[PDB]
Each structure stands twice: as C-alpha cells, then as structure tokens.
C-alpha cells in the first residue's frame, strides 16, 4: 500500500 501525502510528517 502506498502512503498518504502526509504520512511522513509523523
């Protein structure tokens, strides 16, 4: 599953 646009911010 690819990650949402903001996952990386957490």
């Amino acid at each position, epitope marked *: *599953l690819e*990650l949402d*646009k903001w*996952a990386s*911010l957490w």
Partner: antibody
Framework: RITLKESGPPLVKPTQTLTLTCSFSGFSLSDFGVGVGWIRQPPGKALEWLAIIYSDDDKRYSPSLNTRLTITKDTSKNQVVLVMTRVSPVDTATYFC?????????????????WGQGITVTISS | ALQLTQSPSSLSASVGDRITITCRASQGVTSALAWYRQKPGSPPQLLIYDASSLESGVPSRFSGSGSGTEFTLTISTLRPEDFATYYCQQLHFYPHTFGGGTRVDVRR
C-alpha cells in the same frame, strides 16, 4: 466559510460518460497541501472513496476505478472535475466532493472537514 | 486493500445512553482516522479528526481514541440528533478507505 457544491447531470445513460464539477469558495487550490476529494454513496450503502487531487496537482484514484476516472482542477475557476467513463446502473449513487486541510497543526489533514450537499446521479437507459 | 471493519454494524439505543463504537483496520494507520455522523439525506459531518481531536464546532459529548489498528468513538450522552449512521475513514494509505458504517436507531 468553506463551501463545496457538486454539479452535473442527474441522469446518465449506461456506457455514456459522467462529468461532475466541484465548485468551491472560502479556500483556494493554491493554499499549500489543500486537497479536494470525491466520495460516492450508493442508495442505502456505505461511502466509497473515489479520488483526490491536491494543490500541486498530485492525484490518486481508487485502484478499482482507476482506468475509468480522471480528476482535474482549474484554479482560475475554483473548480475540480471528475470524469467517470462507461458507467453502469451500479454507478447510481450520490456523489460528494470534500475539502481536505493541508499542513498548517498536522493531524487536521487526517480528515475531510467540509463536504458538499452531494449530487444524486442515476444511471438508466 | 486496507480493510476497515466497523462494530457494531447496527445498534439500538435511547436518548441519554452512553455508546461507544469501533473501527478496526487490517494494518496500522497511526492516528490518521476520522469519524463522521451522517443523517439521512444529508452529507457526512466530521466529528473527530486525527483519531482523537474533536473537530471545532462539534458537541463535547463526542470523543475518540485509538491508534494503529483499534479506534473508538464515544457518545457520553446520546441525543435525538445522534440517531444516524457513523463512519470512520483512514487517510494514512492510498486509497483512503471508509468503514461499512454503524447504524444507530431508536430502541423500543
């Protein structure tokens, strides 16, 4: 403040193409990270995620409907457009477009905060 | 696909009851889970964003908790405006999945 509204044909014919527009105000697609998504709901069924498009034009579609959906945005008009091809009676539902907050204050992107009335589309020959 | 299971799918309660409902995710979605209340004929209305944060303008009776795979929505005291269908949505993975919904009706 932020309001969204869906527009298009309430009656579409099987195989024909469905074009929907989301007109909004109270926010612009030039605001960092802002998104606008499409969610549909068949009569008496659960919500179904369709697609999302952001300020930078980043797009994502539901894998299952990917070869049938195309999402675009026109900043000059504050409108987002969804085009669904070869529709069938099963695509009969209410379509909603919603606003998604961008990073300011992080967690508030984890949701679609403002939705449009939704538009009822019926697929019949 | 990431499966979101809502429990219970259907529920009967009375005004003044305290109900809690859950939404299970097949994979961890961290805190990226939202809750909505949808009344018949009306669009979904955000209650909780980021799993535990009360959305501005929403009654204090609503609350949310959880992280990873387990999440709950609690209504300290149920009002008439609360007999509707509830949905959870994870926005951690694409696609953004919605649960099947929890229907809350009046008990008799």
């Amino acid at each position: 403040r932020i309001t969204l509204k869906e527009s298009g044909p309430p009656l579409v014919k099987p195989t024909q193409t469905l074009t929907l527009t989301c007109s909004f105000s109270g926010f612009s697609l030039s605001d960092f990270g802002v998104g606008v998504g499409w969610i549909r709901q068949p009569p008496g069924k659960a919500l179904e995620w369709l697609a999302i498009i952001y300020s930078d034009d980043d797009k994502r579609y539901s894998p299952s409907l990917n070869t049938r959906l195309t999402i675009t945005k026109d900043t000059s008009k504050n409108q987002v457009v969804l085009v669904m091809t070869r529709v069938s009676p099963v695509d009969t539902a209410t379509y909603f477009c919603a606003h998604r907050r961008g990073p300011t204050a992080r967690g508030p992107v984890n949701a679609m905060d403002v939705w449009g009335q939704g538009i009822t589309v019926t697929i019949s020959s | 696909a990431l499966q979101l299971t809502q429990s219970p799918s259907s529920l009967s309660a009375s005004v003044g009851d305290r109900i809690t409902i859950t939404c299970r995710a097949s994979q961890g979605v961290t805190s990226a889970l939202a809750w909505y209340r949808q009344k018949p004929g009306s669009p979904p209305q955000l209650l909780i964003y980021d799993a535990s944060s009360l959305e501005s303008g929403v009654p204090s009776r609503f609350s949310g908790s959880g992280s990873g795979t387990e999440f709950t929505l609690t209504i300290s005291t149920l009002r008439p405006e609360d007999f509707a269908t509830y949905y959870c949505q994870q926005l951690h993975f694409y696609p953004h999945t919605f649960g099947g919904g929890t229907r809350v009706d009046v008990r008799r």
